[PDB]
């Protein structure tokens, strides 16, 4: 094929082939001349050489081309690929109808939705647009449909509405760790060029917002859509395929907010008020006439699936904080109080999620997980946790323990120089005194800080 500008491009095989034919024709001529044995053999040598270099160069003297510095690529090389077969395997199968750009958070979105940028979908879903434009008769033909897509008037949005409704879309990230590196979602159009990902599943993708990009594929047929929505949908795969434990587990804001809410205090606003129900508690808190963390007696009815998933109402007095009562409101009637009754950390939250799945089932845990996300965000925001210079507390006896450790290591180095101690003994002594001193500093800061 000719390159632009007058230039030509040719395979190395063509030049090798050409030389092959040339030498063969010369051999034909040489035969017609009745050439001596020595020269006929040399020509047969050259022929054998050329042929075998042509098939697979590399078992000979490495017969490159004229002046082009790189060794010529033989027939074998064209097939034999790294890694794996050239055309069938990596790299790498390019596919149409795909896009790639940066992911962005988007707190208000629900578990099964995603922000899908405007201009991408405009380009991608072109034929769906054209088809429905012409079938509904909003546009006379596909050519006029093309001019009308390229202007981008009100008409485009209705067709966009109809395709994006029943389309499910796939999000992909290059480190395909497991099958959940691609999940199916319902796309929701948003302004901008940034993809919105649901926060909870960021942990599964191991994604962070520092310029990472994700890929977005379009299942085109109805069957693909079905397979995506049924088998590949995010909401269907909450459980890790590896172990039974959760994959879509809390990331960070959630636990922090919950901690603010779940944490108990000696005394705050409205210590020792006795409430006949949770909603009054929450009403009191929202007015700032009560703190979220305060030990309190609340009248709450736990419900139990003792029957075939029915409600087994037990109705009396619980002693908890305000915060756990409010969260327990959100909590569906099938969870035992016991679960929220405790400290609630990452441990407890994950076990809670797990137990919720096993006893309650799929949908309560799904919806409740969404709930937990929003609540955690809310109370995290109201907590107002920050990081000041005084927040990193130098433990009271720091320099004492440091100077003691310093004087003792200096004493043990000088008594090393004295020659009652091998290298092993010295190593043991140094490492153990440092370990014990460091653990002392650790445990003293933890003691000092925890109950202050």
């Amino acid at each position: 094929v000719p390159l632009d500008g007058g230039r030509f491009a040719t395979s190395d095989l063509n030049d090798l082939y050409r030389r092959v034919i040339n030498r063969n024709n010369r051999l034909k001529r040489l035969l017609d001349l009745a050439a001596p044995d020595i020269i006929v053999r040399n020509e047969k040598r050259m022929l054998q050489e050329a042929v075998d270099a042509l098939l697979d160069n590399g078992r000979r003297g490495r017969a490159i081309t004229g002046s082009n510095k790189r060794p010529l690529k033989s027939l074998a090389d064209m097939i034999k690929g790294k890694q794996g077969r050239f055309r069938q395997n990596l790299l790498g199968k390019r596919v149409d109808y795909s896009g790639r750009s940066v992911i962005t958070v988007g707190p208000y979105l629900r578990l099964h939705q995603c922000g899908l940028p405007k201009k991408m979908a405009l380009e991608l879903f072109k034929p769906f647009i054209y088809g429905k434009l012409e079938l509904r008769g909003l546009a006379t033909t596909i050519k006029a449909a093309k001019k009308m897509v390229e202007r981008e008037e009100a008409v485009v949005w209705d067709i966009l509405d109809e395709v994006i409704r029943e389309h499910p879309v796939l999000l992909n990230r290059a480190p395909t760790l497991h099958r959940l590196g691609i999940q199916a979602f319902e796309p929701v159009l948003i302004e901008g060029k940034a993809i919105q990902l649901h926060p909870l599943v960021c942990a599964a993708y191991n994604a962070d917002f520092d310029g990472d990009q994700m890929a977005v594929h379009v299942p085109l047929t109805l069957e693909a859509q079905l397979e995506a929505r049924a088998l590949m949908m995010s909401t269907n795969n909450i459980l890790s395929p590896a172990n039974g434990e959760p994959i879509i587990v809390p990331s960070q804001d959630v636990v922090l907010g919950l901690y603010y809410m779940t944490r108990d205090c000696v005394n705050a606003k409205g210590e020792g008020m006795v409430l006949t129900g949770p909603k009054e508690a929450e009403r009191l808190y929202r007015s700032g006439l009560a703190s979220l963390h305060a030990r309190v007696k609340v009248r709450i009815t736990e419900y139990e699936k003792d029957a075939n998933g029915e409600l087994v109402a037990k109705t009396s007095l619980k002693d908890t904080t305000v915060g756990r009562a409010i969260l327990w409101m959100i909590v569906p009637k099938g969870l035992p109080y016991s679960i929220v009754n405790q400290a609630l950390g990452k441990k407890a939250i994950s076990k809670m999620l797990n137990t919720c799945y096993r006893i309650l089932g799929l949908k309560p845990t799904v919806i409740f997980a969404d709930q937990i996300m929003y609540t955690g965000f809310a109370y995290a925001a109201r907590s107002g946790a920050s990081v000041g210079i005084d927040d990193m507390v130098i433990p009271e006896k720091k320099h004492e323990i440091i100077s003691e450790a310093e004087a003792e290591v200096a004493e043990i180095q000088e008594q090393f120089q004295s020659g009652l101690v091998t290298a092993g003994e010295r190593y043991n002594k140094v490492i153990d005194i440092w370990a014990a001193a460091n653990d002392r500093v650790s445990k003293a800061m933890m003691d000092n800080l925890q109950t202050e």
Partner: peptide, 14 residues
């Protein structure tokens, strides 16, 4: 002793 010298130049020269 022949050390796999594939070069037809050398053989022919010989």
């Amino acid at each position: 002793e022949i050390g796999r010298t594939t070069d037809p130049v050398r053989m022919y020269m010989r």
